[PDB]
Design a protein around this ligand. Structure first.
Ligand SMILES: Nc1ccn([C@@H]2O[C@H](COP(=O)(O)O)[C@@H](O)[C@H]2O)c(=O)n1
Length: 388
């Protein structure tokens, strides 16, 4: 039987891990590979190095039916080595289990590798507190059992269903926070249930790659040598997390850019409330949708290094190139940063957040403070920061 490897993810972190797995196996030029990574465009001059390499789009967290037309090209007994986003695993595997069910004679699942989307899985599991988690697991197993007949896609508990894959397939989970599963008491029946099928997400695989594969991976994730160069400076590094706009009582976007430079100055200037030290090299990490606001900040900030807004923090962590300190406007990205690297997280105004107390009740901030990742004093409501 032929193994076909499937790499599926609508988001970023699983994809970045799956592109790592491909890099690790990149000497194999003809292994059947199907890439459904919505956010990553593999360059042609990588693709043409390979054969039996295929691409499928995702629509609504599911590969399209063009997936079947690819799999049809492989008429043998085939087993599927599948890589998935955890939060979206059910929808992603839907069309795959359909192809399986439609060809039970010859198609089997070799194994699953599942990676956190991010803060989402953990914000989701918090909502499950006060449920009988043992009971929820068993029901979801029961429903999965009836489902690789497709007599199911009605999970009573969509969140817990993400974690019963072992009842049917060999699986490995890669968790952003194993500390959460081990320390959330309500999740003890799930922790124990999962036994040896989970591990902490590795951030170090890049370190064990060859320099050739390291360069390969940087190409896969669109991380050029000049940005890399900037981030290897033998000096303390601070990275400011930029944003778009908020409720500033104006729709003049330049005002939001200006304000963000004020926020930056609170880290970089001795007068600022959150001054990090004179010895820090300053970087700006713009929001991906920041647009011309990122252009404004760049053009009006002195002695800063821009890190292209399409470069994610997850890629900085995958590559071992995360700064000494991260600070600035709140984003879910902070949930996955090492505790010792978080300086101050600044929440701007919106419908939900109109104060520091509001910001301390942010769903990912709740997970964070529970895990001891941050202190309340690290959470700043933007209005308490004076005009410099
Ligand atoms: N400065 C920033 C702000 C957000 N981001 C990323 O962009 C995405 C959108 O962030 P928000 O949901 O906070 O608007 C997040 O997934 C986060 O990883 C970033 O890479 N740099």
């Amino acid at each position: 039987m032929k193994t076909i490897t499937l790499y599926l993810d609508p988001a970023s972190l699983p994809a970045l891990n799956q592109l790592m797995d491909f890099t690790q196996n990149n000497e194999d030029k003809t292994h059947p590979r199907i890439f459904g990574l919505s956010r990553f465009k593999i360059p042609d001059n990588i693709i043409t190095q390979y054969q039996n390499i295929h691409f499928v789009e995702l629509k609504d967290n599911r590969p399209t039916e063009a997936l079947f037309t690819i799999l049809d090209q492989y008429p043998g007994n085939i087993e599927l080595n599948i890589h998935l986003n955890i939060a979206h695993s059910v929808q992603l595997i839907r069309p795959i289990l359909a192809y399986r069910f439609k060809h039970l004679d010859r198609v089997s699942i070799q194994q699953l590798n599942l990676y956190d989307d991010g803060s989402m899985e953990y914000v989701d599991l918090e909502k499950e507190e006060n449920k009988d988690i043992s009971a929820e697991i068993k029901q979801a197993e029961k429903q999965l059992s009836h489902y690789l007949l497709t007599g199911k896609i009605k999970f009573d508990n969509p969140t817990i269903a993400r974690y019963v894959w072992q009842s049917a397939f060999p699986v490995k989970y890669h968790f952003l926070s194993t500390d959460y599963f081990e320390k959330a008491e309500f999740l003890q029946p799930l922790k124990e249930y999962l036994a040896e099928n989970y591990q902490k997400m590795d951030w170090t695989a890049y370190q064990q790659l060859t320099p050739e594969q390291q360069a390969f991976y940087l190409t896969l994730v669109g991380f050029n040598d000049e940005v890399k160069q900037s981030l290897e400076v033998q000096q303390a590094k601070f990275i400011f997390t930029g944003t778009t706009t908020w409720e500033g009582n104006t729709d003049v976007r330049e005002y939001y850019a200006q304000q963000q430079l004020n926020l930056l100055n609170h880290f970089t200037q001795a007068e600022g409330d959150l001054f990090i030290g004179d010895h820090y090299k300053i970087y700006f990490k713009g929001h991906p949708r920041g647009g011309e606001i990122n252009d404004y900040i760049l053009n009006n900030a002195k002695n800063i290094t821009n890190i292209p807004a399409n470069i994610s923090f997850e890629v900085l962590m995958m590559t071992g190139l995360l700064p000494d300190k991260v600070g600035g406007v709140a984003s879910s990205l902070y949930f996955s940063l090492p505790k010792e690297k978080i300086s101050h997280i600044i929440f701007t105004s919106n419908k939900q957040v109109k104060s520091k107390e509001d910001a301390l009740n942010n769903p990912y901030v709740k997970v964070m403070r529970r895990l001891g990742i941050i202190d309340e004093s690290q959470v700043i409501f933007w209005d308490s920061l004076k005009q410099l």
